[PDB]
Write a structure and sequence with these properties.
This is part of a larger assembly, with eight protein chains of eight kinds. Chain C has one helix at about 5-25. Chain C is mainly alpha-helical. In chain D, about 45% of the residues lie in helices and about 10% in strands. Chain D has helices at about 1-20, 25-30, 65-75, and strands spanning about 35-40, 50, 60. The N and C termini of chain D lie far apart (about 30 Å). The relative contact order of chain D is 0.19. A five-stranded antiparallel beta sheet of chain F has the order 4-3-2-1-5, with no helix packed on it. With about 60 residues, chain F is mainly beta. Chain G has about 150 residues and is mainly alpha-helical. In chain G, about 55% of the residues lie in helices and about 5% in strands. A three-stranded antiparallel beta sheet of chain G has the order 1-2-3, with no helix packed on it. The longest helix of chain G has 24 residues, at about 85-105. The relative contact order of chain G is 0.09. The chains are: A mainly alpha (about 40), B alpha+beta (about 140), C mainly alpha (about 30), D alpha+beta (about 80), E mainly beta (about 80), F mainly beta (about 60), G mainly alpha (about 150), H mainly alpha (about 725). At the B-E interface, α2 and β7 of B face β1, β2 and β3 of E. The complex binds chlorophyll A (9 copies), beta-carotene and iron/sulfur cluster. One chlorophyll A sits at the interface of chains H and C. Chain H: Keywords: 4Fe-4S, Chlorophyll, Chloroplast, Chromophore, Electron transport, Iron, Iron-sulfur, Magnesium, Membrane, Metal-binding, Oxidoreductase, Photosynthesis, Photosystem I, Plastid, Thylakoid, Transmembrane, Transmembrane helix, Transport. Chain H: It comes from Sesamum indicum. Chain H: It is a multi-pass membrane protein. Chain H: Its EC number is 1.97.1.12. Chain H: This is Photosystem I P700 chlorophyll a apoprotein A2.
Chain lengths: ~40, ~140, ~30, ~80, ~80, ~60, ~150, ~725
């Protein structure tokens, strides 16, 4: 349990989780606010 | 130590290879490594393949000093055999090389004088302009 | 007139003479 | 482990053939319909990749040859 | 023949000598270090310039330095 | 003779990997014939993965 | 307007581009039943294009002699929404990231083997640090005055 | 030394083939030769300069002779817009009959080459009209070459050798060069323009046999010595003037009209004469600054020593720099190369926008070739400037004599310099590539209106400050009521504004979003190349990985596999790396120039305006589109006159690919393979009778880098030269 939490804190796993969350956020923003060239 | 001479001892059993001596040995020099073995045994050759070293004296001729030293270190590490090697010239002149003092060079020994020892740190070498238009190098000073 | 004579000289004969001389120079001693 | 990965890959291929493909339309007209087993989502304008492969289907034309193998197997 | 030089930052662990493929270096008595021995290069005519000694040098900076110099048949490792 | 053992010292050798850095003195040789008596240990490894070096008495500054 | 450009609500090339895009989309509509899902998907693309062009008209962008929007960066007060405001938002996000990274690197520096917290991240410590970037300009300024920002070597 | 090279005993004792290769490669490195002295160094360099001048004169004499012998200059000066200039004839025994027919161009009777160097226009503008004029120019240039060789031999003799102290007299040489080599030469050139070229453009034929009988101006030196110089500018050529004839010809010899000649589309000859007179005056005045023998003037040493800011922020300022510059030939060479490389690019940028030769502007192939030629030369020279600056730090730099001056502080904060250059290059590359890829993705998805197109507003505003009215900015010269426009209202502004606002020349071309991205690409290339070269120069003496780098010289292979690995650690390797970036940068600027001009000459600039915003436009509408005629030079149905360029295209491709072998594969693989070949030769019957005299070995580590770089550069130059010439000559714009 402790060892598995230590493994999930390793660089590649944390990196893929973080970038997946970022990609999902950006994708949803672009889905609901598409084609933004300026900032109104 | 008084260096040992070069007898007519036999050679290891080998079938021959294309990696042996060339015409450089005929006109410039070649090398001869001699050792003593307690039993007949397999040993890898520095020129490729495997040969049989005989029990008793063994003499082998090679093209380079590096080949002789590589074979010697392999003998010392694997078979625990002491070795010597010499440089032979086309006019029959034999020059004893290693072990030079009778003691291997990694072990300290009296009677040796330093050659190329600089009594300064490597950072105290002078700049090139100080040796410009002279024939001397900065590390030779 | 001239090109038919000069082109073989500059393109073949002169390089051959120069190569022979330079090879004999670099093989000296 | 390698065999498990290969089985996962094959399962994905068959699932995409079953769920996101025009295989059943290609069966009735294999000379005029281009095989397709991938359909993209409508995001950031990428939905242009769903081309007219025929058979009332939009997708990405596939070149793996799975449709012909499935037809040969009797699927 | 290449040039091999030894500086007094030597600690005398004999690492360069046993890394020599052509037996160029050796150890000689000294008094400037705790080991009471320093390296020397009396046979630089057999030097090939592979710089294996510098890879075995523990001192910072290097205590054995190899400078590539005029090339001979021995220094280029030619057997033909 | 030399900085006290365990102290923190700045390196003044120009060619050293830890030039202008800070290390810890482990031991200092008391033999007057020793050229570089001060043994220093550093936190970072050099390009040769070595964390210890010997320096002379004038290449080390007590900080 | 600026640099000889005309607003995209006036330029005829912009409207011509919008008409040609819709015509290109409507040609593939002919190959499907009027009630099919591909017909419903191309209609959504047509509405998306109409909305895009209408928005580009409304925001007040300048278009060249090609019918394409052109950005104005020099600093004009009626074109701040193209470079200035997005740039400020980017500079706020990037400074946030940099400051959170710097604080985490400082927090693990004084340990036995601090290279293990750089490959295996102490997630609770990162959670503590992360939300300090919301006020990163204030702290970054304040360590500039005191002198805790720059190492004086 | 008993063998070759005789200047290097160490190389002479090498028993391998390397003795030859290196002997060729170190011939002109006089500083590293056996028993070299400073006096011998200076004398040898002085002698070599004369030989270089002789070669330069011989090359020009050959060009003139071949143009006069096999060219069509006399037929070209009667139809410059419809006669193709001829460089020389072709006599190749390998030619076939279709090749003989296809290469018979101009009005020649056999195969010929069409000259794209612009020598015809240059010689026509300066007054040369007949083949005999070129013949007598070639003889004079041959005479000059012979005299340069004679002087080079003379100053090598015992009683004419100059001393080192004479070579180090900077003040006298500067005075003489500024006043004589620059000033007096310009005065002589404007004299030629007034006496020969300007009359020549109005139908007057003035030569050596009659130039003492013809007045260059009706008033004849009266106004000059009286003071009313305006009489030399009263009656200029009319706008309806036809070049070479007296129709609409004036009498003025020195004017300030500005703009271009309506028929020739080039600068007025009188403006050129006035410019050269003004420059001659400026240089003659500037040549009286330094103290030589008469108790007046300046001392450069004192000037440099006195310029130390009292605040201490520059350290000891420029103190001592006179001796470092004067005693180091590498410092002088680096300064000269940097300045010359800057002005080579200046010439390239000014010659295309302000043509000075008659009927050059509508000879598109010549313009493109000249611009590319001069920009690539400048690119190479600028790399040389940094290479020799790096060599100076190793060989000639004296740290003790330069204590705390402006030159030591650079080595003090080299890290701050290099890191900031790296940041600038990283920022430029990241954002330029990101914008290009974004535009490419929008164009792929069928939404060109989502592109990020930034207007180059700063440069458009600068253009409007020069009088361009295509953007409606109304600033400075574009304004009517300002003082700047009012000052030159009646001198040069009319003609200059008319030329600037004429939208079919190369004077201040209209720019849009496509130019903004390519200019930032050029900036990124410049920054990265300077980063590489500056990092190489400032780290030449040593670093943390190699603290004793100055002890190994400018060019050495490495420090071995220890300490993690030391590949390409020498300063020579930094130059070797930076040559690739220089080539890439110059290729970018030449691509930009060629594509922007080839669309303007075709009448559709909109092809470049819309297609230059994404990289697939560059790949398709510039490279793919313009290679249709070139690659069809020879095909299974026949050949045409473009076959030479088609062959050279593939030749450059092959050389460029061959260079990759030397750049990728390294030495040990080749040495181990050569050993087997040596055995095979030694064991082959009827071949044992033949023995080599130099032992065959693989190329050295540094030698292979140089060879691969040479192949890379040769292929890079030849491929683009063939493509540019063939693409601009298939359609003529
Ligand atoms: C440095 C280069 C660069 C730059 C400046 C941009 C900039 C942009 N791209 Mg782009 N792109 C790039 C590289 C770049 N891209 C590359 C390399 C690719 C290839 C993969 C793409 C592929 C691409 C696509 C496919 C699309 C864009 C889009 C966009 C726009 C997004 C607007 C948006 O979503 O706002 C909304 C986002 C925010 C406001 C950010 C919010 C961030 C946090 C959550 C804020 C909350 C805390 C405060 C914007 C103009 C989209 C667009 O509409 O273009 C017009 C679009 O569809 N780009
Ligand atoms: C560096 C200057 C230069 C260059 C690059 C060339 C180049 C060329 N010349 Mg040439 N030439 C030159 C100067 C030059 N010339 C001068 C100064 C003269 C007057 C003596 C000539 C007289 C000349 C003749 C008479 C012929 C050429 C020819 C040629 C072509 C074939 C090469 C050949 O046979 O050489 C010949 C070179 C020489 C005869 C002398 C070389 C010049 C110096 C003194 C050596 C080639 C394009 C041939 C040609 O047109 O082919 C179709 C030909 O028949 N040349
Ligand atoms: C400027 C350089 C140059 C010149 C002038 C020539 C000239 C020629 N080449 Mg050639 N060549 C060159 C470079 C050159 N080559 C290079 C660099 C290559 C390598 C790519 C080749 C490869 C090449 C091939 C593969 C062939 C030619 C052939 C020919 C001939 C074609 C004419 C013909 O059909 O008559 C044909 C006429 C004959 C066969 C009779 C020639 C009899 C000669 C004149 C006798 C005199 C020789 C003389 C005693 C030797 C002097 C040597 C010198 C060192 C002193 C012609 C003589 C062709 C040929 O047939 O030539 C042998 C041929 O097959 N060349
Ligand atoms: C080699 C095998 C393979 C490949 C290449 C694909 C490829 C694909 N499948 Mg697929 N599939 C496969 C096997 C495969 N499948 C198998 C075996 C099955 C049967 C179970 C399926 C069942 C299936 C369905 C039912 C669907 C797909 C879909 C898709 C497409 C979109 C997938 C997507 O966006 O992921 C979705 C995204 C993720 C799974 C996220 C990645 C997770 C990683 C670990 C990162 C986690 C970070 C996370 C996202 C951030 C939030 C975490 C949270 C803590 C905050 C894509 C072409 C979809 C499609 O084509 O739509 C039209 C679709 O609907 N597949
Ligand atoms: C290339 C150098 C350069 C730089 C650094 C700037 C910088 C600036 N410009 Mg500017 N500008 C430039 C060239 C430049 N300009 C050129 C060439 C033009 C001619 C088109 C303009 C036309 C221009 C206008 C019309 C305005 C600015 C404004 C501004 C300011 C932005 C507003 C702000 O931050 O409030 C502080 C800023 C100081 C705005 C401002 O308010 O300036 C005070 C503004 O309204 N600029
Ligand atoms: C703590 C993170 C951090 C910070 C504060 C900086 C800060 C800086 N870097 Mg840098 N860098 C970083 C990480 C970081 N870097 C990493 C990870 C790399 C390897 C890819 C680099 C590679 C790099 C180069 C090659 C250069 C810089 C340069 C610079 C300086 C100019 C800004 C710049 O060019 O940014 C550009 C920054 C990058 C290209 C890398 C950003 C990588 C991400 C965004 C950082 C992520 C950090 C970490 C994963 C998050 C921490 C999470 C934690 C809470 C658990 C600036 C001092 C330049 C310089 O010295 O000039 C003055 C320069 O040339 N950096
Ligand atoms: C008035 C006296 C005088 C004159 C005319 C010269 C002239 C010269 N000296 Mg000199 N010298 C002098 C006094 C003088 N010196 C004195 C007093 C000393 C002792 C202190 C020296 C010591 C000295 C040394 C030590 C050396 C020279 C060298 C040279 C030559 C330089 C190479 C060259 O031709 O550049 C030509 C330069 C120009 C024409 C001017 C620059 C032109 C710019 C860059 C281009 C712009 C022009 C235009 C736009 C382009 C034209 C376009 C079209 C026509 C193609 C040159 C011939 C060098 C040499 O090569 O000697 C053999 C050399 O090594 N001199
Ligand atoms: C006024 C200009 C000038 C002068 C006087 C010098 C003078 C010098 N340079 Mg220098 N240099 C210059 C410009 C100049 N350079 C420029 C512009 C560059 C950048 C390209 C360099 C780059 C450079 C380097 C990197 C080095 C020098 C070195 C030297 C010194 C020895 C040169 C030597 O051994 O030559 C030998 C030169 C050669 C054997 C030339 C090789 C052949 C080249 C690659 C041309 C090949 C063309 C190809 C065959 C074409 C094929 C055509 C195809 C159709 C077949 C000498 C003091 C060297 C030195 O000793 O420095 C300490 C050194 O290491 N220079
Ligand atoms: C097309 C080939 C290419 C490219 C792209 C580069 C790019 C670069 N070179 Mg370079 N170089 C090349 C060929 C190339 N080189 C060649 C042939 C040579 C001759 C040997 C050199 C020699 C050379 C030297 C000597 C130097 C450089 C430097 C640089 C950097 C300059 C800064 C910059 O532009 O930042 C922009 C950065 C980029 C464009 C890199 C691409 C970044 C990608 C697009 C973003 C990531 C995409 C995505 C998220 C990754 C997902 C993939 C994966 C994880 C699945 C940059 C990384 C200099 C340097 O290091 O300065 C910092 C430097 O000193 N190069
Ligand atoms: C490494 C080295 C070196 C080198 C360096 C280099 C190579 C540099 C370069 C540099 C450069 C290459 C620089 C450049 C510069 C430029 C400039 C400086 C420009 C300026 C301009 C101006 C100032 C202008 C102005 C104006 C006018 C006047 C008119 C128009 C407008 C305006 C305003 C724009 C040496 C040898 C020294 C030595 C040491 C080492
Ligand atoms: S490979 Fe070339 S660079 Fe790398 S170590 Fe061996 S020699 Fe030095």
């Amino acid at each position: 349990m402790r060892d598995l939490k230590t493994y999930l804190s390793v660089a590649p796993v944390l990196s893929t989780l973080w970038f997946g969350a970022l990609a999902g956020l950006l994708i949803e923003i672009n889905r609901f606010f598409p084609d933004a060239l300026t900032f109104p | 130590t008084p260096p040992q001479l070069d007898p007519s001892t036999p050679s290891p059993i080998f079938g021959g290879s294309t990696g042996g001596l060339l015409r450089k040995a005929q006109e410039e020099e070649f090398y001869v490594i001699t050792w003593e073995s307690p039993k007949e045994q397999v040993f890898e050759m520095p020129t490729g393949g495997a040969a049989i070293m005989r029990e008793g004296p063994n003499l082998l001729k090679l093209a380079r000093k590096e080949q002789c030293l590589a074979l010697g270190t392999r003998l010392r590490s694997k078979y625990k055999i002491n070795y010597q090697f010499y440089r032979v010239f086309p006019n029959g002149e034999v020059q004893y090389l290693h072990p030079k003092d009778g003691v291997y060079p990694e072990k300290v020994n009296e009677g040796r004088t330093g050659v190329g020892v600089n009594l300064r740190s490597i950072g105290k070498n002078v700049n090139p302009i100080e040796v410009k238009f002279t024939g001397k190098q900065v590390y030779d000073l | 007139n001239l090109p038919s004579i000069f082109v073989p000289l500059v393109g073949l004969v002169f390089p051959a003479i120069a190569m022979a001389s330079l090879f004999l120079h670099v093989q000296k001693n | 482990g390698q065999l498990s990965i290969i089985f996962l890959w094959l399962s994905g291929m068959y699932f995409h053939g079953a769920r996101f493909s025009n295989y059943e339309a290609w069966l009735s007209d294999p000379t005029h319909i281009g095989p397709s087993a991938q359909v993209v989502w409508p995001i950031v304008g990428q939905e242009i990749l769903n081309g007219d492969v025929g058979g009332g289907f939009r997708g990405i034309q596939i070149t793996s040859g799975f449709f012909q193998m499935w037809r040969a197997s009797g699927i | 023949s290449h040039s091999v030089k030894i500086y007094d930052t030597c600690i005398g662990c004999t690492q360069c000598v046993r890394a020599c493929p052509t037996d160029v270096l050796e150890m000689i008595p000294w008094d400037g270090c705790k080991a009471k021995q320093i390296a020397s290069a009396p046979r630089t005519e057999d030097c090939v310039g592979c710089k294996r000694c510098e890879s075995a040098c523990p001192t910072d900076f290097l205590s054995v330095r190899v400078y590539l110099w005029h090339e001979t048949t021995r220094s280029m490792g030619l057997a033909y | 003779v030399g900085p006290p053992r365990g102290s923190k010292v700045r390196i003044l050798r120009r060619e050293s990997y830890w030039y202008k850095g800070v290390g810890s003195v482990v031991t200092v040789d008391q033999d007057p014939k020793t050229r570089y008596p001060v043994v220093v240990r550093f936190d970072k490894v050099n390009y040769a993965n070595i964390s210890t070096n010997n320096y002379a008495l004038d290449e080390v500054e007590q900080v | 307007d600026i640099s000889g450009l005309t607003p995209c609500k006036d330029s005829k090339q912009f409207a011509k581009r919008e008409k040609q895009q819709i015509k290109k989309l409507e040609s593939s509509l002919k190959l499907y039943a009027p009630e099919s899902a591909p017909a419903l998907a191309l209609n959504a693309q047509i509405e998306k294009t109409k909305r895009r062009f209408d928005n580009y008209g409304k925001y007040g962008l300048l278009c060249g002699s090609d019918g394409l929007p052109h950005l104005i960066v020099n600093g004009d007060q009626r074109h701040w929404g193209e470079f200035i405001t997005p740039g400020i938002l980017f500079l706020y996000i990037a400074g946030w990231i940099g400051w959170v990274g710097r604080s985490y690197l400082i927090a693990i520096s004084g340990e036995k083997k601090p290279a293990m917290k750089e490959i295996i991240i102490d997630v609770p410590l990162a959670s503590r640090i992360i939300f300090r970037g919301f006020i990163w300009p204030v702290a970054a300024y304040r360590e500039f005055l005191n002198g805790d920002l720059i190492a004086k070597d | 030394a008993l063998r070759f090279p005789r200047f290097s005993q160490g190389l002479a004792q090498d028993p391998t083939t390397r003795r030859i290769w290196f002997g060729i490669a170190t011939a002109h490195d006089f500083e590293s030769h056996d028993d070299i002295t400073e006096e011998r160094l200076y004398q040898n360099i002085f002698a070599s300069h004369f030989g270089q001048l002789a070669i330069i004169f011989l090359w020009t004499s050959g060009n003139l002779f071949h143009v006069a012998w096999q060219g069509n200059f006399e037929s070209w000066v009667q139809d410059p817009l419809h006669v193709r200039p001829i460089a020389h004839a072709i006599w190749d025994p390998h030619f076939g009959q279709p090749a003989v027919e296809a290469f018979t161009r101009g009005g020649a009777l056999g195969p010929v080459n069409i000259a794209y160097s612009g020598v015809y226009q240059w010689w026509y503008t300066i007054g040369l009209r007949t083949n005999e004029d070129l013949y007598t120019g070639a003889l004079f240039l041959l005479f000059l070459s012979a005299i340069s060789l004679i002087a080079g031999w003379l100053h090598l003799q015992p009683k004419w050798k100059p001393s080192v102290s004479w070579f180090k007299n900077a003040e006298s040489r500067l005075n003489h060069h500024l006043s004589g080599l620059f000033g007096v030469s310009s005065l002589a050139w404007t004299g030629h323009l007034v006496h020969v070229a300007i009359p020549g453009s109005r139908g007057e034929y003035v030569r050596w046999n009659n130039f003492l009988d013809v007045l260059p101006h009706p008033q004849g030196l009266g106004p000059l010595f009286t003071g009313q110089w305006n009489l030399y500018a009263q009656n200029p050529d009319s706008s309806s003037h036809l070049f070479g004839t007296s129709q609409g010809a004036g009498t003025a010899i020195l004017t300030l009209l500005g703009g271009f000649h309506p028929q020739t589309q080039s600068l007025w000859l009188t403006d050129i004469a006035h410019h050269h007179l003004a420059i001659a005056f400026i240089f003659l005045v500037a040549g009286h600054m330094y103290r030589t023998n008469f108790g007046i003037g300046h001392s450069i040493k004192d000037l440099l020593d006195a310029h130390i800011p009292p605040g201490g922020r520059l350290g000891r300022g420029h103190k001592g720099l006179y001796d470092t510059i004067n005693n180091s030939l590498h410092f002088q060479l680096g300064l000269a190369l940097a300045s010359l490389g800057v002005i080579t690019s200046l010439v390239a940028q000014h010659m295309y926008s302000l043509p000075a030769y008659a009927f050059i502007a509508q000879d598109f192939t010549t313009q493109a070739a000249l611009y590319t030629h001069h920009q690539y030369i400048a690119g190479f020279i600028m790399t040389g400037a940094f290479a020799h600056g790096a060599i100076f730090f190793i060989r000639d730099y004296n740290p003790e004599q330069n204590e705390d001056n402006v030159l030591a502080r650079m080595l003090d904060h080299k890290e701050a310099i290099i890191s900031h250059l790296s940041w600038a290059s990283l920022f430029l590359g990241f954002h330029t590539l990101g914008l290009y890829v974004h535009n490419d993705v929008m164009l792929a998805f069928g939404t060109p209106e989502k592109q990020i197109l930034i207007e180059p507003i700063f440069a458009q505003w600068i253009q409007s400050a020069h009088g361009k009215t295509s953007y409606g900015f109304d600033v400075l010269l574009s304004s009517t009521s300002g003082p700047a426009f009012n000052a030159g209202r009646s001198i040069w502004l009319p003609g200059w504004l008319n030329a600037v606002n004429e939208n079919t020349n190369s004077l201040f071309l209209t720019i849009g979003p496509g130019d903004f991205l390519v200019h930032h690409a050029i900036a990124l290339g410049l920054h990265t190349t300077t980063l590489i070269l500056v990092k190489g120069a400032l780290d030449a003496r040593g670093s943390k990985l190699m603290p004793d780098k100055k002890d190994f010289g400018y060019s050495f292979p490495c420090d071995g596999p220890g300490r993690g690995g030391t590949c390409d650690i020498s300063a020579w390797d930094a130059f070797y790396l930076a040559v690739f970036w220089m080539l890439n940068t110059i290729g970018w600027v030449t691509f930009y120039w060629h594509w922007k001009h080839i669309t303007l000459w075709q009448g559709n600039v909109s092809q470049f305006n819309e297609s230059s915003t994404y990289l697939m436009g560059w790949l398709r509408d510039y490279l793919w589109l313009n290679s249709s005629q070139l690659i069809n030079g020879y095909n299974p149905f026949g050949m045409n006159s473009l076959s030479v360029w088609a062959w050279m295209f593939l030749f450059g491709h092959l050389v460029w690919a061959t260079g990759f072998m030397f750049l990728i594969s390294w030495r040990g693989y080749w040495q181990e393979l050569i050993e087997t070949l040596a055995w095979a030769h030694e064991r082959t019957p009827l071949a044992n009778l033949i023995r080599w005299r130099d032992k065959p070995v693989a190329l050295s580590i540094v030698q292979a880098r140089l060879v691969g770089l040479a192949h890379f550069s040769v292929g890079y130059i030849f491929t683009y030269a063939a493509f540019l010439i063939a693409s601009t000559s298939g359609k003529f714009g």
